[PDB]
Amino acid sequence: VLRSVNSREPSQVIFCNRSPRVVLPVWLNFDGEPQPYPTLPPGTGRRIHSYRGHLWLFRDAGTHDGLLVNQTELFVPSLNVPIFANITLPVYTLKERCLQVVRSLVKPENYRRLDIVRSLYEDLEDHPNVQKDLER
Amino acid sequence: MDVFLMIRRHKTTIFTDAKESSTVFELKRIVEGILKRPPDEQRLYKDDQLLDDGKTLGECGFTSQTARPQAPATVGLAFRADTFEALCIEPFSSPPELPDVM
Amino acid sequence: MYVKLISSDGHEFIVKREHALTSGTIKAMLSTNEVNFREIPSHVLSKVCMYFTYKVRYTNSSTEIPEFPIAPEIALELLMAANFLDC
Numbered sequence: 001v002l003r004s005v006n007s008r009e010p011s012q013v014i015f016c017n018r019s020p021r022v023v024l025p026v027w028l029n030f031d032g033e034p035q036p037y038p039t040l041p042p043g044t045g046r047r048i049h050s051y052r053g054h055l056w057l058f059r060d061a062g063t064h065d066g067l068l069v070n071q072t073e074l075f076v077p078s079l080n081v082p083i084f085a086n087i088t089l090p091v092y093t094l095k096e097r098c099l100q101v102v103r104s105l106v107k108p109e110n111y112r113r114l115d116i117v118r119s120l121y122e123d124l125e126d127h128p129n130v131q132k133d134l135e136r
Numbered sequence: 137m138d139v140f141l142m143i144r145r146h147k148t149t150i151f152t153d154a155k156e157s158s159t160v161f162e163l164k165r166i167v168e169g170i171l172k173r174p175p176d177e178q179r180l181y182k183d184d185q186l187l188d189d190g191k192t193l194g195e196c197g198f199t200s201q202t203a204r205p206q207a208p209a210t211v212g213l214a215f216r217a218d219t220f221e222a223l224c225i226e227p228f229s230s231p232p233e234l235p236d237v238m
Numbered sequence: 239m240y241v242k243l244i245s246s247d248g249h250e251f252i253v254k255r256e257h258a259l260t261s262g263t264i265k266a267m268l269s270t271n272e273v274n275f276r277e278i279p280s281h282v283l284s285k286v287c288m289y290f291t292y293k294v295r296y297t298n299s300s301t302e303i304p305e306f307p308i309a310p311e312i313a314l315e316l317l318m319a320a321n322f323l324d325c
């Protein structure tokens with residue numbers, strides 16, 4: 001339902017990682033399956049050959065935190081008059097940002113050992129995920 | 137360019153912004169609107185240094201890249217009761233001991 | 239124009255009303271221009287206010303948004319506050 005269009009029409013794309021995260025580019029193939037590509041270090045760039053009508057999204061390579069590309073969630077290469085794909089941090093909610101920090105300090109096994117409301121215990125293990133966000 | 141500040145006195149803290157080109161006096165005008173105290177009854181400090189009314193915030197080392205929204209610069213405030221009290225800023229509460237699981 | 243947010247240890251934080259209305263919780267507590275937080279100490283509520291300024295600044299900005307910093311010692315308590323405030 002959310003797949004790349006097999007147009008076979010070449011489209012030069014520049015991946016510009018303007019975030020302090022290691023970015024994992026994800027290409028949704030013609031079946032809708034998320035296909036990972038080589039990661040981009042923070043503040044770095046990379047030139048890749050893609051195609052018109054192809055679906056891309058971007059995540060933190062280590063935590064799968066959601067990232068924005070051109071101020072949205074989905075990047076679709078268009079006709080080349082190289083299309084620029086600006087990858088930036090979104091403004092996370094304070095709750096989600098706090099979750100990211102706690103997850104990176106505590107091993108998933110010790111989520112239960114933390115003194116918090118059980119509601120937070122569940123939120124902590126509900127890690128950001130490509131398939132989870134992939135629905136509509 | 138906008139600078140982001142914490143104007144602090146005792147247990148009071150004001151979060152506000154201002155232009156780099158704006159003056160220390162103009163910041164006292166802001167404080168006046170909020171705390172109902174005239175500029176002549178106010179003193180503004182960068183750390184321990186008394187700030188002069190005519191100087192711009194940028195001249196006083198409040199730049200848009202050090203007075204950031206997520207990490208605002210601190211401006212000390214001292215009122216006049218007719219003598220001026222000493223600059224006094226109560227520290228925030230201390231964080232608990234870092235949990236062993238962290 | 240400005241509202242007052244008081245921490246559990248007496249610290250009084252004064253922020254713009256627009257900034258404070260980020261939290262739907264705080265909006266409800268205002269409706270009376272002061273809110274008392276019995277559970278939120280100073281070192282947490284101060285970060286909450288910094289986030290308000292941060293959020294208003296970088297929402298729909300298109301500029302390179304910087305990371306919102308959270309010290310490891312604060313993360314645990316800030317999470318509980320953020321959860322409660324739906325921030």
Ligand SMILES: CNC(=O)[C@@H]1C[C@@H](O)CN1C(C)=O
Pocket residue numbers: 027048049050051054
């Ligand atoms: C090296 N370039 C690729 O791998 C491109 C990028 C993406 O459109 C998918 N794709 C294919 C199927 O060739």
